[PDB]
Design a protein around this ligand. Structure first.
Ligand SMILES: Cc1ncc(C[n+]2c([C@@](C)(O)[PH](=O)O)sc(CCOP(=O)(O)OP(=O)(O)O)c2C)c(N)n1
Ligand SMILES: Cc1ncc(C[n+]2c([C@@](C)(O)[PH](=O)O)sc(CCOP(=O)(O)OP(=O)(O)O)c2C)c(N)n1
Ligand SMILES: [Mg+2]
Ligand SMILES: [Mg+2]
Lengths: 362, 330, 362, 330
């Protein structure tokens, strides 16, 4: 027998130009708890499998993993509606999953097969879904885009909001400050979110920003700092920020304090700019899956066995998806030129020489 | 009867498209309350208001990014750069966020946006304000680039650009804004469109093919008038579209005329003329050239301020006539 | 007989992240007073002549006048050394003069003659001098350049500083915020100066920025707001800011609240976004030359006759320069291609067609 | 003597120029403590410290602007873009603040800066990270653009770029970094320079002139090796410099071989090949062609991720051979 729900204390958020922030207690139901655990574990195992596939040369090029930040993508999704919009950068395997795509389609895209979500045209960095305006490879570029999506939300008067995520490294991009100004000036329903994983590739926040209070960079825009290792903190902070935007009070900044277990990308071991002890200290003290597990077990919301069972189902699913991604055939060469233009009559595009022609269909 | 300036033609175009689709809107610096930096958007803010016609602060990368975002979200924005010299700040949004997105998404995400504004040489504005960007934007797959000349071109292309579900770059011309043209009844109609990708023969001829785009088209027609008094009949082609350009039309023309001269305002190296010439050599019309194709372009320098110098950094009628006479060996 | 100096009250500066600002009292000497008066009048007469030359079509293209903001350029120069560095945007006729160049070369450049400071290649927007890195036509572009010039100051260790000016319209440029961050991060001796004349071309500050406190936009960088119509106020704020950077505490923002009498450029009457009553009231209550004139006469620093004397000489100087600018020959066409590359052997450059060749000499 | 990789060659160059002039310095993302994003700047920060080798935040427009400023103030910076795809954010600083200034100033203000970093296609990095910028930067008066291939090119060009008192864009190549070449004693010297603007003949030949730049030069040499066994001898030309390109060398070669094929990695339209072909037509060598000159380029599409697609979006050895055979009609 289990309790149907329980009440938890969550960390208070540091505030900037706000009298009150999100509440410091929240109610978690058993069913919601189980869902969040499964989701986070799914993202986790997917990333670990991607790491395995990259080392076997089945994934090439870029491959940015997000394990350690599972509370972020799952937290944000928990505090928003499917009708809401979200955009981020290249570290988007989790968000792709939380926003609807299957681990099959995500892995098949990473392995560059026809069964991918973009038919293998995209790879790790470029995946799109329902109200998910993708990962973007140009640092900062997605922030104006997000405010643009926010502008459409207000323009259509549908009471939807847009989450626009960027990293600590991105936080120093000029276009972001141009976006603050306009989003504030027009009162756009935009939630600027800075995922702070302490590093911008190989550069720590201390060496990259004169002020490391990312929730304050907005200046005239009000902000708040959240514990990005706590699923429940993020969820509650997100519901607050979304409410703030839905009421028409304009944009707002949200700094998520999180962490990544892998280096920047697969081409970066991540040991030259940080210690192995630092990583281990976060994993044994603040692992987002461990935190949730402890909460649910200690409050009689779920059992240790029930959760280990979920772990087993999730690992198997990931195993089955990886076999599909590895065995699925590459895109047919005849479709190289497809999807250059939308809503256009077919035409032909030049290949490596003038005698090579590829058909282009919308 | 009824003279309409290129400026008013563009205004007319955006006005009709704004009324037709509530999802279309205009943004940029001074577009609303100031009535347009070059008075192109005159009366529009009065007619449509704060929601549809939006003044922006001076933040190119920012408001171009916002425009693309709105487009991805289902809106159909018209993003104005006060001149295309200023587009360089936001060119990453144009190329990387807009042009390539549909392809990278595998056909799941279209970007129905239009970037417009005056491009190229003006009068005495010096090096940082005179740059032509036709070749830069024409270089990139996923874009469509057009470059109107007269009032018909401007209105037809701007409406086609807007109705096109892709990023279309409309390179306008500041010196052309004030010039009036006979606006036939067909162009006054709300369904007047010019297909992106089709060239136009502004003058039938048999002796030499003269291809151009934007303002110097008018200069080609002046040159052709002079040469006609000497027995030389030039076929003047107005490109209209930079990408995808209309080589078929040029080829057929050179097939008849046996000679070719390209005329552009921009810099020569890796310019519009270079591609036209490279294509003519590679194509089925090369055997029909009785003389090498030559290029008339602007001088290979940053735009100088001084009048006598600026005059010689831009193709003049006499420079076009000189090149034509060299090819015909007369 | 006259007093050797006098003491005046100046407006207190609003502060941002500063314990104390510049004094509210300052001493003006007779010699300095006469000098500042002559300088301000010259810049004024120069701009009035440029406007007149533009309407006679002797100046074409762009021509942005700075009359009304004379207290700024003369003020800033009064608070720095000739060895210090300064860069601004296109409204730089005054600064060109205060940094050393004569009205002859400034006007001859505006009229596009060989006797101009840029040999008629530059025009109104592009004029350069010793430690004056010119006017720049791209809005905002000069701010990173300025932080760059400042970087060189620190790099060479000569204890020089750099003034980096931008307008209120420019303040929302992304690169400016990128410049803030690095300049603070490396403690650059950069003085970011925002000339606030209330308008960005045709867009007032209220319609362009969510926050109209420009001396605070720096966020983590400390700032101060100055009265830009008072020569002495600007001078004192400048000496304070210069001392601050020289002491090695890094960058600092300085907002000068001023006003421009003309409409942004010659192609803009500037009456559609502001009333003439507003302009006339600023001219009759806060004219920088008039304020100084009254101070020096009423405190026995100079006589009405002495100032009337200076006016006559300045008028003569401006007239002699205008005759030079009207009659000076245009640049020779053979020199069109000159100055493309520095330190190179001569070569040939293509003209309008392949048969037109220009010699290019470094 | 020894095998030296392109990466180590570039490194050696920057190391020698840094020691020679205290005014030279390097800035960019991860250039210092990370030992370089592609290990090109390895060991430099260790040797020179915080002052000479500067890690910057991700602020392209900002640190490029800062660099140009330092150059105006008398310093000689080396601004690295992690890839030239990211240079688009700062391209206004490269063109408007750097390239045009000496001209606009009337010769009073030189801008001794160098912009370097990998350009063009890599391996599986997709559309926003594969773009070649040779045609874009080669378009602009006031710039010099270079595009090394082997180790000798890399070291010589980087040193010439630095000692040159003007803005030089050094388009490097990621896939070439790891490739070793026999480094002759002359290249080992700290005084080794390669003059900007001079092409190089990598292989003598009599049947056809094959011109290229950067990585595909190596592919042209492979194509010549196969064709040599069939009796066809190709004269392979490594451009080295994109602007001002060395047309004289190409012309002299084409006068001998009577045939021409250009090879580039970038997009075809308005690309490097387009200019070469136009220059051939306008030049004294046009009459020496027995067949039209043709272009081998990357496919006219944004770079796809998948292996089989990416392989066919880039010039392959078989594509160069096929084009050569059409031109020679064998
Ligand atoms: C405008 C721009 N400048 C630099 C880069 C290079 N870069 C990247 C990638 C996507 O290319 P690739 O791994 O080489 S990621 C990256 C660092 C970003 O750091 P953060 O913003 O903190 O992101 P996160 O820690 O979440 O990964 C840079 C500078 C880039 N994309 N875009
Ligand atoms: C990036 C960029 N965006 C827009 C412009 C256009 N512009 C200008 C000029 C120099 O070109 P031209 O008169 O057309 S000036 C200008 C407005 C700047 O206003 P402020 O910064 O307040 O400066 P000020 O009031 O002293 O003129 C704009 C938007 C520009 N240069 N650069
Ligand atoms: Mg980070
Ligand atoms: Mg202003």
């Amino acid at each position: 027998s289990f309790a149907n729900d329980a009440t938890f204390e969550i960390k208070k958020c540091d505030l900037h130009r706000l009298e009150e922030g999100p509440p410091v207690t929240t109610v978690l139901t058993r069913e919601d708890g189980l869902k969040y655990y499964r989701m986070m574990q799914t993202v986790r195992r997917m990333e670990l499998k991607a790491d395995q596939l990259y080392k076997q040369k089945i994934i090439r090029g870029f491959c940015h993993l997000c394990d350690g930040q599972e509370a972020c993508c799952v937290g944000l999704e928990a505090g928003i509606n499917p009708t809401d919009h979200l955009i981020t950068a290249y570290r988007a395997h989790g968000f792709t999953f939380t926003r609807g795509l299957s681990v099959r389609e995500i892995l098949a895209e990473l392995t560059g097969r026809k069964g991918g979500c973009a038919k293998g045209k995209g790879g790790s960095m470029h995946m799109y879904a329902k109200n998910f305006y993708g990962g973007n490879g140009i640092v900062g570029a997605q922030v104006p885009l997000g405010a643009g999506i926010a502008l459409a939300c207000k323009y259509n008067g549908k009471d939807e909001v847009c989450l626009t995520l960027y990293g600590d490294g991105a936080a120093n991009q000029g276009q972001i400050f141009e976006a603050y100004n306009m989003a504030a000036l027009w009162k756009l329903p935009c939630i600027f979110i800075c995922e702070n994983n302490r590093y911008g590739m190989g550069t720590s926040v201390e060496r990259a920003a004169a002020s490391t209070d990312y929730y304050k960079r907005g200046d005239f825009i009000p902000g708040l700092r959240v514990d990005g290792m706590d699923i429940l903190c993020v969820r509650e902070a997100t519901r607050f920020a979304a409410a703030y935007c839905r009421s028409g009070k304009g944009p707002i900044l949200m700094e998520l304090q999180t962490y990544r277990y892998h280096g920047h990308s697969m081409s970066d071991p991540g040991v030259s700019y940080r210690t192995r002890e630092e990583i281990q200290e976060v994993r044994s003290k603040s692992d987002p899956i461990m935190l949730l597990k402890d909460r649910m077990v200690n409050s009689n919301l779920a059992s240790v066995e029930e959760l280990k069972e979920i772990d087993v189902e999730v690992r198997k699913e990931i195993e089955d998806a990886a076999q599909f991604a590895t065995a699925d055939p590459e895109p047919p060469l005849e479709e190289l030129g497809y999807h250059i233009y939308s809503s256009d009559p077919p035409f032909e595009v030049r290949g490596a020489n003038q005698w090579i022609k590829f058909k282009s269909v919308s | 009867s009824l003279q309409v300036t290129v400026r008013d033609a563009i205004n007319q175009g955006m006005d009709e498209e704004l009324e037709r689709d509530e999802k279309v809107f205009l943004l940029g610096e001074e577009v609303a309350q100031y009535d347009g930096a070059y008075k192109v958007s005159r009366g529009l803010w009065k007619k449509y208001g704060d929601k549809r016609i939006i003044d922006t602060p001076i933040s190119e990368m920012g408001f171009a990014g916002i425009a693309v975002g709105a487009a991805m979200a289902g809106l159909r924005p018209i993003c104005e750069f006060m001149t295309f010299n200023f587009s360089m700040q936001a060119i990453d949004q144009v190329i990387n966020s807009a042009a390539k997105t549909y392809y990278m998404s595998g056909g799941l995400q279209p970007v129905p946006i239009v970037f417009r504004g005056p491009n190229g040489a003006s009068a005495g504005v010096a090096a940082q304000h005179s740059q032509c960007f036709a070749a830069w934007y024409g270089h990139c797959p996923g874009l469509k680039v057009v470059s109107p000349w007269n009032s018909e071109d401007a209105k037809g292309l701007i409406k086609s650009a807007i109705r096109d579900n892709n990023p279309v770059v409309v390179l306008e011309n500041e010196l052309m804004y004030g010039v009036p043209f006979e606006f036939p009844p067909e162009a006054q109609s709300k369904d007047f469109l010019i297909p992106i990708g089709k060239a136009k023969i502004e003058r039938q001829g048999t002796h030499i093919t003269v291809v151009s785009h934007s303002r110097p088209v008018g200069h080609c027609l002046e040159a052709a008038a002079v040469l006609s008094k000497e027995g030389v009949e030039c076929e003047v082609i107005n490109m209209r579209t930079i990408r995808p350009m209309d080589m078929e039309t040029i080829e057929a023309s050179v097939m008849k005329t046996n000679h070719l001269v390209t005329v552009e305002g921009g810099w020569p190296q890796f310019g519009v003329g270079a591609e036209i010439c490279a294509r003519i050599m590679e194509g089925p019309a090369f055997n029909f050239l009785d003389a090498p194709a030559v290029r008339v372009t602007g001088a290979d320098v940053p735009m100088p301020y001084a009048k006598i110098l600026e005059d010689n950094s831009i193709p003049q009628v006499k420079d076009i006539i000189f090149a034509i006479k060299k090819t015909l060996n007369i």
